[PDB]
Design a protein around this nucleic acid. Structure first.
Lengths: 93, 91, 91
RNA sequence: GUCUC
RNA sequence: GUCUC
């Protein structure tokens, strides 16, 4: 869980996230490239949802690490470290 | 490079605008074919960057590259321009 | 310019033909080095512009230039010609 | 767990 | 000619 750090505190827009499969892609607002995001990377989840998720089109803040199969998001939160909004496909508690 | 099919319809799966490549899913064979920026024949006239967009229907020829099938002469259906990526600014 | 390493194998991370530069990730140290189009020693004869291509394996020396570690005498593995970039048109 | 419930 | 066609 110690993967090299390529960039820190990057702002991105969730392109899409699939709750069933537990991954999606965030598009970096600076470079407009996609970054793979797994459901385990989400640090400050929506407290009203049990499952970890981000929702399509949501603004998120994160670090980029060199993952096992490419660049990966980690430490994903809302802007300024607030909880994410979560996917509308992730059920509320 | 040998021609494997002409005038096929496919759905763009994703396209990376920072480095200019993505993949198309052919609607007949459901295989994936690589698409490079340089293979787009009829680009969106309103955008400077040459690109295609996720989910877009495109029409293309398919050739055999080193590492797999590649799209070429890529257009929108009927030869009209592609829509291009949401991540490529308009002029 | 002082030499930091000779005969390094690396993988092109990206190379922009329009601006004439890119980065190579060294296969031994996994560090990035800058490469300018003037540093390519064995270009692909069948492309007009000088370039290397995304994901290609290159062999080079590492010098320290004005703005950081820099790649020089860039060839393909063993000194053969590089493959070059898809963005560099073929003759 | 790399282009979708 | 130091993170982009």
């Amino acid at each position: 869980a110690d993967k090299p750090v390529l960039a820190t505190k990057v702002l991105g827009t969730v392109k899409w996230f699939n709750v069933r499969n537990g991954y999606g892609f965030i598009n970096r607002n600076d470079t407009k490239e996609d970054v793979f995001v797994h459901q385990t990377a989400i640090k400050r989840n929506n407290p009203r949802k049990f499952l970890r998720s981000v929702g399509d089109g949501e603004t998120v803040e994160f670090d980029v690490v060199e993952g096992e199969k490419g660049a990966e998001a980690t430490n994903v939160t809302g802007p300024g470290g607030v909880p994410v909004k979560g996917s509308r496909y992730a059920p509320n508690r």
